[PDB]
Amino acid sequence: AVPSVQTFGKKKSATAVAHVKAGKGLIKVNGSPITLVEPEILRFKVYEPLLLVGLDKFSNIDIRVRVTGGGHVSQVYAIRQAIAKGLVAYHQKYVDEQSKNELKKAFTSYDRTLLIADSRRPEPKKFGGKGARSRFQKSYR
Amino acid sequence: MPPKQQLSKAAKAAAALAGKKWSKKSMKDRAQHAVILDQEKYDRILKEVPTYRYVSVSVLVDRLKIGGSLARIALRHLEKEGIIKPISKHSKQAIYTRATASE
Amino acid sequence: SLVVQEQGSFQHILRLLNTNVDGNIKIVYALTTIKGVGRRYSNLVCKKADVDLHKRAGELTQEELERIVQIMQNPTHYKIPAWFLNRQNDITDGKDYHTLANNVESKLRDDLERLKKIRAHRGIRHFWGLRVRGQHTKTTGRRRA
Amino acid sequence: PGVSVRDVAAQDFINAYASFLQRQGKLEVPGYVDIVKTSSGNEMPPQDAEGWFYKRAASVARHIYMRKQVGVGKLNKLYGGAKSRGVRPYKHIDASGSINRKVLQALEKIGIVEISPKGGRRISENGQRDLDRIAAQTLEEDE
Amino acid sequence: TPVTLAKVIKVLGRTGSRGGVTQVRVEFLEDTSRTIVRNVKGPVRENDILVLMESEREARRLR
Amino acid sequence: IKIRITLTSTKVKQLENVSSNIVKNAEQHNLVKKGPVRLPTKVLKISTRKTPNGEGSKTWETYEMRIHKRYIDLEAPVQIVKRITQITIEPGVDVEVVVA
Amino acid sequence: GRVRTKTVKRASKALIERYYPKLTLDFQTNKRLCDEIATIQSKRLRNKIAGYTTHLMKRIQ
Amino acid sequence: LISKKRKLVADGVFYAELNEFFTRELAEEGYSGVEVRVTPTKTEVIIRATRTQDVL
Amino acid sequence: FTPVVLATPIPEEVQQAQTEIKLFNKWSFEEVEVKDASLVDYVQVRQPIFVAHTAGRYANKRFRKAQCPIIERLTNSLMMNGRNNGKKLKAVRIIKHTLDIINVLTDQNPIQVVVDAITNTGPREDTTRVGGGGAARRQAVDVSPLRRVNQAIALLTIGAREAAFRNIKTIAETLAEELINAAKGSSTSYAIKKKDELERVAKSNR
RNA sequence: UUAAUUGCGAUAACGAACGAGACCUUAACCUACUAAAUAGUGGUGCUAGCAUUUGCUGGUUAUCCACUUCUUAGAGGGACUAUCGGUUUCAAGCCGAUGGAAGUUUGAGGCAAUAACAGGUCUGUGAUGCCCUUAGACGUUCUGGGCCGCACGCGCGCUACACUGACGGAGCCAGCGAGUCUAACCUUGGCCGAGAGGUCUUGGUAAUCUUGUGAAACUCCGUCGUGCUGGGGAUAGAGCAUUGUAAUUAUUGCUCUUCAACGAGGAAUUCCUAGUAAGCGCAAGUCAUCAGCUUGCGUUGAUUACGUCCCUGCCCUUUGUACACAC
């Protein structure tokens, strides 16, 4: 019966479910520690929520996120958005607003899609070409 | 639509009988690269590579003219000796610098 | 620290199986220039005869050279699988053969002549010098003669 | 903390296992795994040779723990690569079943994995015990 | 090469047959209050500063 | 006596009508039940060319079947299988009653 | 562009010439008012008419 | 038992067959429409024509 | 400083980067300036970003591409020649290695060196095509500074990749060397030679 | 002024009608109503290990409780360019900033007006007029060939011309869909096999089993090295099986072996403005067997345009015609 919040995270096709709840600072993703997400380069991208505002907010709660769908970079963007939205959900549900508003302002100042799902989605393709807009080669004579 | 001028049998045969290019080959001659680490290629490596501020496989093959394979064990030996300090480690590229007296 | 300097053990040119093979390359891939032997067979022979897979070709000693030589000469008595021969179930003899640099061309000419003599369709096509295996020559093949 | 393979780095786990069974030498090598291709899409036989079978066994022993139950067909599907069918484009081709089956029989004999219902196989009690035990040393090795 | 940094205030319009050249009226901050008409190849908006090599090179409508 | 009624058809409005009528009929008395579960829509695609022969542009269409499935579960004594069996079937709508 | 179609223009002027006491300067309330009174088949159509009437109210105030 | 998609396809083919064969047969009567309502027990097929005395 | 190691073990460099600005974890985003003010408002130095791989819609508007990070612009521009499409992780890894070269040689901030080279090899005067009407005659036209940035970055990318083509030297090291030469003003850089040639063409057809 | 005969306007015109528009589908948003063991989520039991602590990773329907945030619609709401600063006969409309899931009619499709083509089709139609034949028939059927045949010339595409690479290991994530009851389909698990595959079994008429289709492009470790080399396996010889009554002109797959041209492609020419191009793979179509094709889907995902009629073309008005099958 411990208070908790849940949210979603999507980039283009990946859904990440979050279970942000009070804890001692558990941070692992998919049951695996945050140090293992996949890129060894974009590793800092999922860290940015940890660093933009500070680890004190993460100290009093914990995040359990399960992501499914998409692939690789879409995956990591999905967990990034999911953890950001879960933290902000616990912020506006069980946390003082004076920190939540400043946190949201900093998040939006850094990048808009932290709390907003990306609007770019795949579109149907058309006949006469491999791609949606690129048509097949047509030669005269 | 004007009719197509059908070629005669002999004309078609002559046109198809004819049915031969070349290559510029502007690349320079192959660079003779050593495949065995000899004593003379050992002593120069031990002597002069502390001078370079930037050490890498490409630099080593370009200047000391040894095989790229032997280059890797050479850098490993230098790393074990501590004469160079690494900066970034990767399978496709290794970044080493001279061991300066500072830091 | 694995740095070695021999005063001299490297042979510039070796004479395995009537071919002029140079050095400066790995011994595992040195047996690719011999006709009838490729990369996989070379690696298989190297790992079967424990010839230090990660080693160059020129500075190869004569004992292991002779070992490589006789394992070219015959693979059968050394429990090699029958899957690795180019003349499986030979027509003339019946024992699987692995005809080699001086033998692959002779055997190819031999069965080509057999097909020509039996007046086979494949033999007559090969004699004509043309596609023999279900190939559309309407648009394929222009720089031949 | 708990120190489990889910909390263990994948490559560190693989190297630690490749050291561990290579050192102990109790895996039942079938003896024929030295020249096979392990896939029709592959081009070269194994290069490591000595540690190849042990690397494969470590990988699978990781895989059954990560999943619930995984069969030889699923393992073949995941191991198989894209075959260069000459001028024709690439396509996904399943790996070799015999070597993988010998690997699963090897863990069956050793005691890492046992039989499981609903198809596939599931990690054994001793298998999970050793999987979580090796995590300890492979963590304080880098700690 | 004597350069002159000059900031634009009014794009006249797109000139040229292919429409790759845009006319603009531009002046320079250093000793301002005198302006010249220049032609820009790339996309130019207001309050954009450009490096002119030339000073007495009043241009003309392109074709 | 577990009675399940599976409803299948293209007409979504007709399916909603039948499902609502069945839900009201089962709500009559008590007959505890679960309401409408929404299965994913099974769009069936058939790709054809406009021109019967080879002349013309390479025009294609994808004709679509839009079938809907909505099954309702019921659990009660032998009364329910006689007071629900009455058939409210309309054109285009298919029902299947399965026991146990 | 965003040029209003003559049909929505006629609907908007008919609304303006008849329901001035009903029409207000707030978009949502007069959109609901159009929902009640004007029998429009499609939500996008009636919403476009409501927006046009709001613009006309702002202009002719 | 036939799958749901194939059963619906077969029902559509049934309707098309009935429509075509009625357009072929009920010519002089001006066949206008058919309803193929199905009830598991008894299937009912209703017909509309302008001279139903000739249908009967 | 915050030494908090809450629950899951987290490397100290993470808190080190969290303390100050994004820093790229190695390269101080501050202490980076720009050249003459004509090139400002198109090479930003006031928006630190952790990783040089993003998914922004920089092409939605005319000047949304101007707000794209300069190092991100280099990462994107390196991604061409067909088969090298995608693999932005590989691209940004190559740029990270390039920044390593830039720090190793003539020690300076890699972003500052990149900005200096971008400003240095900027075509300040380019010709345009004009309809012949009897004879093909060109005309000399000034260029936008965003256009100058585009030409500069394209020149570096193509010149470095062509130098690295069919060569033992890696793309990262070759492009870092080309960047260092362009920043230093040496005439050996392909971008510098092409910029000088375009300048001479434009001055000739005055 | 608009993409629009789209509107404001003026005005021998008025009322109008088709089209565009309008309309429908799909792609995103909903902590809002309905929920759902053919999807789950959190807790309660058995419960494996580590920790020993309270906790972590898990599995397990007749072991239960709560819920729909995530998975799916049903009915609905929402974006109408809303607010602001402007520009604007200052009317339509247009330019920038804000909130914003969504601001070029939000993106893309479906339908798509009059009139015409001597455009394609009697080789889709038991829909066909006329002409030809009707009993060694141009009907049907059987056997073998043929559509693949080879001096060559062209158009759609695939593979590469290597280090941003090639090869071997490992981490390795999706969507569209499809599937057999008297036909024999997807196949799961075990076993026998390098592999191709074979056998014994498992589930499925379908969110329930294939399937989370654990796909590739990717990422990280190693080998190679600027050599037509470890890129290329095109052309070829031998053997092993599957599909097929019937594989010879090899259907196809599998193992070895030969490793040819290609070192960036001139005259000229094709597609494209953002989940776009491009790179990569997957499902389906024909299918006893056979994708380098097509129809759709998914993954990584640039740069450059925010303009024009200079080339190729299109719409309206004026003018000239000796054009009318109309240059």
Coordinates of C-alpha atoms in Angstrom, one line a residue, chain D residues 4 19 33 36 39 43-44 46 49-50 52 69 75 98 107 118 122 129 131-132 141:
Chain D
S4 CA 23.6 -11.4 -9.9
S19 CA 38.7 -18.2 -17.6
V33 CA 34.2 -29.4 -32.5
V36 CA 32.8 -27.2 -38.0
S39 CA 26.5 -22.0 -39.5
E43 CA 32.8 -18.2 -43.8
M44 CA 35.6 -19.2 -41.3
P46 CA 36.6 -21.1 -35.2
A49 CA 39.4 -23.3 -30.8
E50 CA 40.4 -24.1 -27.3
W52 CA 35.5 -21.7 -28.3
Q69 CA 13.2 -21.6 -21.1
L75 CA 19.5 -20.6 -29.8
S98 CA 24.7 -30.4 -33.4
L107 CA 25.7 -28.5 -19.1
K118 CA 6.5 -26.6 -21.2
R122 CA 15.6 -24.2 -17.1
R129 CA 24.0 -21.2 -7.3
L131 CA 25.8 -18.4 -11.7
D132 CA 25.3 -16.1 -8.7
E141 CA 37.9 -8.3 -9.5

